[PDB]
Design a protein around this ligand. Structure first.
Ligand SMILES: C[N+](C)(C)CCO
Ligand SMILES: C[N+](C)(C)CCO
Lengths: 130, 130
C-alpha cells in the first residue's frame, strides 16, 4: 500500500510555499514515503540562478519539516528512469517538456506553488515602515 | 510514559534556530507531546517589540514542523500554575526570574538558542554581493 513519491527542488530560504507543496506531495496517497531531492549549489547556480543558502543549510532545514521522510542531498539535476528504479520511486511530484516522459509513464503528479508568501516578500513588509 | 512539554514563543520568521530549539524540547524524554504556544500580535508588540508576521502566519508555519504535536494559538503571555493543570503540562521548556517558580517545582527544562542562523542574517548575506 505504501507509495514512494519524489520531489526535487532548490529549497532556498524555505517558506510556507515550499512547505505546502511538500505537504501536497506527501498527501497524494493514503500511505506515502516522500523523498525530497535537494539540488547542488553549482548546478543550481549554473542552470537556475543565485542561491542564498548552501546545500548543507538547505538540507538541514528540510530535516525539520513534518512531511519529509527521506532526503537525497545532493540530488541529480535531471531525473532519469534509472534513478526511479534505483530509489524505487512510484511518482514524481512537481509544480520541450522535461516531464513528458514521466506523464507518458503515468508517474507524474502535479503539485502547486503558493505566491506572495516568499521569504523575500517579508523583507518588503519590513521596509514599508519607513 | 508520555510526558507533556510546553514551549512558548513568538516564532516570527521561523528559522533553523527555532527549529532546533523545538527539536530539543521534543526530545527531552523518550516519549513526549510537545505543545507549542504562539504569542498574540498585540502582547508581543507591547511587551517585546515589532513582529513581522501575523499570528496566523506564524501559527501556520509551525504546523509544518516535525517536532510540533499541538499548538495553542494565541497562548497567554505569562505561564501560570492553572495553565499547567488546564493542559496537563509536565515541563516548560525555555531558553526577577519569571521562571523561578517553575524551577522550584521541578517543572523547568532548559533549551538553547542558535545564533547567526537568523532570517535577517540571510539578507545580510544577499547584500554582500554589492
Ligand atoms: C526542475 N529540475 C528537476 C530540472 C531541477 C530541480 O528543481
Ligand atoms: C517569555 N514569555 C513567556 C514571557 C513570553 C513568550 O515568549
Amino acid at each position: 500500500k505504501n507509495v514512494v513519491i519524489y520531489a526535487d527542488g532548490v529549497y532556498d530560504m524555505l517558506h510556507l510555499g515550499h512547505m505546502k507543496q511538500l505537504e501536497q506531495a506527501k498527501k497524494l496517497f493514503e500511505n506515502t514515503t516522500l523523498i525530497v531531492g535537494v539540488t547542488s549549489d553549482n548546478e543550481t547556480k549554473l542552470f537556475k540562478g543565485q542561491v542564498v543558502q548552501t546545500l548543507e543549510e538547505r538540507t538541514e532545514t528540510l530535516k525539520h519539516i513534518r512531511w519529509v521522510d527521506e532526503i537525497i542531498s545532493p540530488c541529480p539535476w535531471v531525473v532519469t528512469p534509472e534513478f526511479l528504479e534505483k530509489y524505487k520511486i512510484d511518482y514524481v511530484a512537481h509544480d520541450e517538456d522535461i516531464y513528458a516522459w514521466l506523464k507518458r509513464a503515468g508517474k507524474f503528479k502535479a503539485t502547486q506553488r503558493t505566491e506572495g508568501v516568499s521569504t523575500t516578500d517579508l523583507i518588503v513588509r519590513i521596509l514599508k515602515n519607513y
